Design a protein around this ligand. Sequence first.
Ligand SMILES: Nc1ncnc2c1ncn2[C@@H]1O[C@H](COP(=O)(O)OP(=O)(O)O)[C@@H](O)[C@H]1O
Ligand SMILES: Nc1ncnc2c1ncn2[C@@H]1O[C@H](COP(=O)(O)OP(=O)(O)O)[C@@H](O)[C@H]1O
Ligand SMILES: Nc1ncnc2c1ncn2[C@@H]1O[C@H](COP(=O)(O)OP(=O)(O)O)[C@@H](O)[C@H]1O
Ligand SMILES: Nc1ncnc2c1ncn2[C@@H]1O[C@H](COP(=O)(O)OP(=O)(O)O)[C@@H](O)[C@H]1O
Ligand SMILES: [Mg+2]
Ligand SMILES: [Mg+2]
Ligand SMILES: [Mg+2]
Ligand SMILES: [Mg+2]
Lengths: 670, 371, 373, 373
Amino acid sequence: LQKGDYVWMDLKSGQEFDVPIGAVVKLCDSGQIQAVDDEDNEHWISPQNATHIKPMHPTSVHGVEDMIRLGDLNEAGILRNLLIRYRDHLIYTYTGSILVAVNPYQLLSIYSPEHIRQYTNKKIGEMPPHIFAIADNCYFNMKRNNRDQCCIISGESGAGKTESTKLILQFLAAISGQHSWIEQQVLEATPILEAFGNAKTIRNDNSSRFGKYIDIHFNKRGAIEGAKIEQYLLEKSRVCRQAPDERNYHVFYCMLEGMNEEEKKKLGLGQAADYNYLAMGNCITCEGRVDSQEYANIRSAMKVLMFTDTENWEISKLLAAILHMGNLQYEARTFENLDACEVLFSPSLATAASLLEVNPPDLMSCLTSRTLITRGETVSTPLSREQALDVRDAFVKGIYGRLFVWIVEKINAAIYKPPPLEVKNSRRSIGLLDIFGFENFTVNSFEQLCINFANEHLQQFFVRHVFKLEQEEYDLESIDWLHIEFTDNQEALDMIANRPMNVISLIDEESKFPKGTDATMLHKLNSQHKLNANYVPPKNSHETQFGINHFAGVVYYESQGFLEKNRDTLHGDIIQLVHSSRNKFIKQIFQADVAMGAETRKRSPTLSSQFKRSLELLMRTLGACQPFFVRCIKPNEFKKPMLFDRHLCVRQLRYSGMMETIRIRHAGYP
Amino acid sequence: TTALVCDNGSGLVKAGFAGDDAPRAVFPSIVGRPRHQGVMVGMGQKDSYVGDEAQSKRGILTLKYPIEHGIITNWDDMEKIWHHTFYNELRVAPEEHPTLLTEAPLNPKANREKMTQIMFETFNVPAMYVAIQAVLSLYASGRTTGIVLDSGDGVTHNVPIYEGYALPHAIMRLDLAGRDLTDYLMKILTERGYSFVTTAEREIVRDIKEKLCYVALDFENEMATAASSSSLEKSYELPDGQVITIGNERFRCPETLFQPSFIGMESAGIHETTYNSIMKCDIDIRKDLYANNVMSGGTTMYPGIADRMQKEITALAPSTMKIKIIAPPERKYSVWIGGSILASLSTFQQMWITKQEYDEAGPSIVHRKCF
Amino acid sequence: DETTALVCDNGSGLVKAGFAGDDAPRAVFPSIVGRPRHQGVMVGMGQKDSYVGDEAQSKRGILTLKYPIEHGIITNWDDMEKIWHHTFYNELRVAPEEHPTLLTEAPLNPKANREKMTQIMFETFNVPAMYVAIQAVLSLYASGRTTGIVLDSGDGVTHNVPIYEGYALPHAIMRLDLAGRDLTDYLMKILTERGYSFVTTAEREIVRDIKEKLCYVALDFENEMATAASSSSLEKSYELPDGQVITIGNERFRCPETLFQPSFIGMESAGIHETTYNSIMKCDIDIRKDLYANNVMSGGTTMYPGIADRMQKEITALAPSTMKIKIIAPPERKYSVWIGGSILASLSTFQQMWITKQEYDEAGPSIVHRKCF
Amino acid sequence: DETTALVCDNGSGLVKAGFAGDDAPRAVFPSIVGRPRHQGVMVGMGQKDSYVGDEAQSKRGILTLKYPIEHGIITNWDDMEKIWHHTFYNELRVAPEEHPTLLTEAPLNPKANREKMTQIMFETFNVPAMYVAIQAVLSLYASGRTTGIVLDSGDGVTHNVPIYEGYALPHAIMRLDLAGRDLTDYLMKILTERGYSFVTTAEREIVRDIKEKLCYVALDFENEMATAASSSSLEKSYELPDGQVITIGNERFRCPETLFQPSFIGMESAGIHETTYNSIMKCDIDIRKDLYANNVMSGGTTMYPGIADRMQKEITALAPSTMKIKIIAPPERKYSVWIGGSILASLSTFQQMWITKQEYDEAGPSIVHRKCF
Ligand SMILES: Nc1ncnc2c1ncn2[C@@H]1O[C@H](COP(=O)(O)OP(=O)(O)O)[C@@H](O)[C@H]1O
Ligand SMILES: Nc1ncnc2c1ncn2[C@@H]1O[C@H](COP(=O)(O)OP(=O)(O)O)[C@@H](O)[C@H]1O
Ligand SMILES: Nc1ncnc2c1ncn2[C@@H]1O[C@H](COP(=O)(O)OP(=O)(O)O)[C@@H](O)[C@H]1O
Ligand SMILES: Nc1ncnc2c1ncn2[C@@H]1O[C@H](COP(=O)(O)OP(=O)(O)O)[C@@H](O)[C@H]1O
Ligand SMILES: [Mg+2]
Ligand SMILES: [Mg+2]
Ligand SMILES: [Mg+2]
Ligand SMILES: [Mg+2]
């Protein structure tokens, strides 16, 4: 017991994300720590509640770059270490092999050509933490062991993931002698790809809805021979359905306003409130941006990437056709003791046919009918109202997905510079992956489940890499570690997608099962997974939420919304209509499909099936390359140069999975 | 390994892969053998022809159906048909793909056991399963409640189902089917002077039936109209070039479905059979059964059959009740569609009869597992 | 602090539940548990092995319905747990471990019933507190009186309890086992005369519905015989679920008549009127006038048209002419037991009469005998 | 003076007729009416539009056989008239106008059946007198007892009637619709598992003969099935009327088992043993000891080789271990109802209970309700 000490003072505040603050000791009477908790707070601590006071370790007292060697290996210590460094303009920190970057919301000067050469050929720990250091060691280890490397950037939306990708590429640009025009193209590619791949969410105005991978290929004893952009895990349910206080991808809004009125007249476009695909979110204008300015940025960036004015007009019409099909209205019909549809007449229907350059009778029949096309006959079957909405939305999502692939292909064509592969040593790639992070919103839906499922694979990949470099490596040189436990956590993944009777297939099964509803899907999940500890069944029959114990924690998903988003039904008639279309662009993007002939369309890979296969392809790519992990944290929600919100940060620390590194320290030799 | 759905019907074989819209291969279930003398030395000689080539060489062959009334009569020919389906049509190795088969509700147990044994030993499938056709018809119709009238080439049967619970005591079976309709048409064509005897001519008569026969709402009024006018008469051209004109036969041939006394059977009509099956079920169930008269099978494709069924069932049922005859336009392949859906379900993946279970229990495992 | 109590009037046929203070019960549903009796053929269909309450009367044609309570005695102690679980979690949407619960019971029942109810409440649902009360007493609370003899008739039991100024006379308590379920069975038996045949438990519900919608109590049984035999004016029609139309005549008032003439179903006991008169006579001579002036009727079986008039006629015939016979039949007498239970549970004076968890933990299941009644 | 009465036990499948005072029925023939269903080509052949009784079986191959009685209730009142005319004239050789007639009926039949029988007898055949009795009472009369519970089982209905010292307990009477006709229809459905297909109403009689000649009741059903699934000792051969030989195994004892397990044909009711136990336990406590030892079995469906041992085992397992269970199965129980009817009609004290022509003329067809039972 002394005075002026640093002591971990533990408030009993009821907030979920609360950890000890600690404060310097003041005066002498009772506890009397105060003298700012860390900002300005006062605590007249009594002797009775002096148990809230724990003396603080000197390593925790002064900020340490390597959190692994921190004295108090707890969330409070790790949260605090970020805080002194952030108040001192230090926005980088290590956790053994993981960089932690805090978005400054300000243009700091830590980045310079001097900083490039200063950090060049410097191992981790030789210098203060920097995004350059991860890039340098990734480049150095690359040629040192002749193995492809990968960098994984993930975090909360708006935490600086995209910027860190630019800076890593900037460092790898300078480590090469030539200026490498490729990077300028890669930066030019960003406005286009962000336009078609990002949308506004309740949390951030610009949120990534897919995984971005930049495969910058490196020539032998050189750099930036070529670069390939590959997209994964593209959310396609948003194109047709938008959550409240959220809006569709920025392209439709940036396109719809800020275009010449005569161009709109040819497309038939009006305002934005008319289209249900853009107005059901009930937030058209996003404060903090003037999308018309973005339209100039989008078009100018396209012009740099060899996008002729013809191509943009082809693109604009397809997006125009998407909106008009969105406003189509279906009415129920009974036919002859069956289910039939009737598309109400509207100018959108005629405009959609003109934009697609298809016969209006052909469009009507394709939207409201299906043909078996068995051997020897055709047989046409009417569709129900719910099925008609499905094929319309599936067609809309199909066009946007293929259009997105074409844009990536067009951008890739101008930057790839196909490396000469006649030599066995093709090239030593350094992948840069910009991936979403774990979110736990107030209302979690089908989109969040697939998003949370993806981080389960990434966390497992992260845990294995950390475990390998944990006592499995640094003990292995000297100290025994076989007694030390290194169990993995695959039980959550097995329940979700890696075991028979997994969660995803039960969603897929209930989608096609007769008289299938969300309530029936929940009963299937409860019946199969009630005994599993990872599954938290609803307490009542009326409750419509099921809980899954992810690595971050128990996350509750709303049953309603499923079986509607996870239905991408493309009949053969859809592809037949595209093939007969006069427009060459619509046929070009459906090129693989217009070579039809398969009745396997009953499969019609649903959004769950497509997401899994995309994730498996993604994991194989990361599996082949040695990984480097970077975590980005946004300190505060209202963009401010210097404001560190504790509750916001510690939530990101818990959901990041970084705490697993600390846990295995305690199991080993802390 | 995609599952195989093989609907071995009495008349046609519908085969394909699970998770597809329509059957991949649909060929007749016949095995033809030469019935003449081969005079040209060096010509390709085949002992048997199965399916489409058997129909193509119909002139010089004798056609036989391995399956009659749902029971596999000739197992050698049935094995030939299975081999043709597996290798020539689907071009798939049976040993790497689970196979799903269909069967009439009240077939003898020996048929099912022999099918299981043939699949596990002759073709060595990894697993197999036998399912009732009416359940698959409901699966294709996308309902969990209703009474199914499945009429094919061999048998006609009704199966009432409510919320997935079948009532076995109310299941009914009838042997009147398209084969009997074709034979009756062959018999009644002789009144006009046309004589068909050979199996090839029986196939021709089947074609004539499928092209010209229809169901009349009022049989007596249709007979009067046919007797009083030539409007109902239609012409059909035989392969050799001769043309035949038929009148009242067009609606007399399908009428035997409603009046089995024409072919000398004492059984009740299909409408009365459906009404009895509904009445055998519980009183609470009858309304949902009346509103969901699902129809399946090729024999239910005659024009006006849905209207006639609705009229008869409305006459039999109480007035307050609502009679709905659901006849999807693709009801010929509804059994196969339902089989594909069933095989695609993840819940069904635990109910396959694996090879180890067969090796341990024997062919009797199929009764314990399937239905 | 503001922990609302729960009132669960779990009868033989219907379960009435709610919160102490409300005007009407929140959840009313039949006390049945159904199990599938057919073969499940569609793979992937929702497989439930039990249906409780209203869910068991929608899928009624593929289930066997079994009442866990008969004649006010719980015979199946797992179906009753199922029903209580449904009532607490799926109907009231409340946690049983944070609400004191009030239960109701017939006057003369085996002590094992109360002991097992105590044990289940305190060991399975872990209620903070419990109380078991007589339904006939709660009927008086609902009627807003402190004096009178109450005639409670559900579908398990019919009992009479005379009370004067809050004092009950136990020696004058009568209990009969003729009730609505026996009425339904007798109607189902006598319907076979006209040709209609109902055998299954599902058809028992249809018979009960016919009884509730068409049966009435005839003031003069012989004259009503004469009118029914001489004319068809008394005949009514009812449509079965499949669309068939049935017509019933004298059965409409033959079925309820067994209340006054129990010899129809083969019982030697006297009618409800004679039972009430004997219960009144067993009491003290001074109390008899006030008991005559206040006859409270409760329960679903007392909802037949004309039952109050015939009860008054019979009791007037039995009783002395000077005494004034008044039959009190409130319009909401079907829920009077629950209303009285709510009123009792919402009293400050009652809050020290709960059986708490500590007393059960120290005394065992026998604490209810010395605490409740 | 010496006018012998007529006893006509018109069952659902067989008609047993004769005279009062005889030992056995004089005319036992199936109760069917046959009509041609084919085309008559030979001009000159005598054409009959109806065949009744044994001639309908002789001409079985070209006729449609229709039972006018189903589940004890007469449905075709012209076919029934034809059968009664044949019984009176072509089988008994007696004019019905000069002989009192005694008829039998199920205990719980519709009240219109009895009235229609009364009207037909009194206006078509002009019988001088008539009476309608209950078959279980006549079974007791034939068995020569006054105390016992009768399990009658023809092929229409199965009913239990307990009687003690000449007093019947109507509230304990149980009726159940599962008998020889349902057993035949179930055998006709389980015979298709081996390849045999009988669908014709003329082929129904072949299945009936197979059931009567090769079916027994197993003491332990599961052990019997295990034995039948391990050897060929239970298989038997039967020759069809055209020379084909059919072999049946476990179908021999799987067909009669549905009497003890009605769920085989999709019925929710309980077995005959449980029905008898419930009927016994629905009686007074003093009667049960004398009813447990007087289980009289009647009807043709109780002729299976081994039913009296299975029933005794089941009732012994259901009853307390201090009562003596005795099943009385007389060797002639197929005609017990008729023998008891003859004995009752031969009684001198019975002659005052005939429904005379004058009484019917005075009181209409409704006299039978108050004159019988
Ligand atoms: N290291 C950094 N230095 C300066 N500004 C940054 C840095 N990281 C992020 N920002 C700011 O954050 C904003 C959005 O960050 P961004 O990386 O686009 O978010 P996201 O990771 O969701 O794509 C940018 O406008 C940028 O100015
Ligand atoms: N358009 C049609 N009209 C009437 N009958 C038809 C028609 N098409 C097919 N059929 C009948 O359907 C029968 C076979 O149909 P299908 O159900 O495929 O047979 P199976 O049930 O044996 O598989 C044939 O015998 C044929 O007579
Ligand atoms: N309108 C009515 N007329 C006649 N009887 C009724 C009526 N409503 C309900 N009943 C009978 O009341 C019985 C149960 O009612 P109730 O007393 O509310 O339940 P409990 O017996 O659990 O107290 C039912 O069996 C029903 O037959
Ligand atoms: N030996 C037997 N074994 C089994 N069943 C028999 C035997 N003899 C007769 N039956 C059955 O008894 C039924 C009719 O017998 P019976 O009691 O005379 O009927 P009912 O009482 O209706 O006249 C027939 O349907 C027959 O199946
Ligand atoms: Mg971004
Ligand atoms: Mg078929
Ligand atoms: Mg009550
Ligand atoms: Mg009899």
